[PDB]
Design an enzyme around this catalytic site. Structure first.
Site, mmCIF file in Angstrom:
data_model
loop_
_atom_site.group_PDB
_atom_site.id
_atom_site.type_symbol
_atom_site.label_atom_id
_atom_site.label_comp_id
_atom_site.label_asym_id
_atom_site.label_seq_id
_atom_site.Cartn_x
_atom_site.Cartn_y
_atom_site.Cartn_z
ATOM 1 N N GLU A 15 -26.603 22.002 20.016
ATOM 2 C CA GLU A 15 -27.285 22.272 18.752
ATOM 3 C C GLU A 15 -28.718 22.747 18.841
ATOM 4 O O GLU A 15 -29.214 23.320 17.881
ATOM 5 C CB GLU A 15 -27.257 21.010 17.879
ATOM 6 N N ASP A 62 -27.889 27.951 10.349
ATOM 7 C CA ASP A 62 -26.988 27.687 11.464
ATOM 8 C C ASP A 62 -26.034 28.853 11.713
ATOM 9 O O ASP A 62 -26.200 29.927 11.105
ATOM 10 C CB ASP A 62 -26.225 26.357 11.258
#
Length: 162
Positions: A11, A20
């Protein structure tokens, strides 16, 4: 390696609001703020999560605090899901990390279409499970990460994260 180190690699860490892989406002170590396309709505969610008016920026400690909460919540969720708990409980600790990683990334609803992969994982048919896991939108949209998570499910080792 452990679940925190693994998710930190998958991440990343960003202290300002960013979008994202799916185009959704996020911050920290993959903390999804909202699927709303309005930046102000994402800023509101951030302030609500941190407890102060952040103006779209947080500190590393704040990011890590949300990360711990998000990992914890991912696990607790799996345990409350009748379809996921038995498979999760059937796994060894390394493969359980792969399961947490999946749910952290796509959510429990995201894992809903993985019924056949789940069955193969509970059966410990690892190569077959790995082949089935890759026949997915998940693998096609984030192949490098999915390949690491799948290798973890296939082997029960941390070879893909060194």
């Amino acid at each position: 390696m452990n679940i925190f180190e693994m998710l930190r690699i998958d991440e990343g860490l960003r202290l300002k609001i960013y979008k994202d892989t799916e185009g959704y406002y996020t911050i920290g170590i993959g903390h999804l703020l909202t699927k709303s396309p309005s930046l102000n709505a994402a800023k509101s969610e951030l302030d609500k999560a941190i407890g102060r008016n952040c103006n779209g920026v947080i500190t590393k400690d704040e990011a890590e605090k949300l990360f711990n909460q998000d990992v914890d919540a991912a696990v607790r969720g799996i345990l409350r899901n009748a379809k996921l708990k038995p498979v999760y409980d059937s796994l060894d600790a390394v493969r359980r990390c792969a399961a947490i990683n999946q749910v952290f990334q796509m959510g429990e609803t995201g894992v809903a279409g993985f019924t056949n992969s789940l069955r193969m994982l509970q059966q410990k048919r690892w190569d077959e499970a790995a082949v089935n896991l890759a026949k997915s939108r998940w693998y096609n949209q984030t192949p490098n990460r999915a390949k690491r998570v799948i290798t973890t499910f296939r082997t029960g080792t941390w070879d893909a994260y060194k």
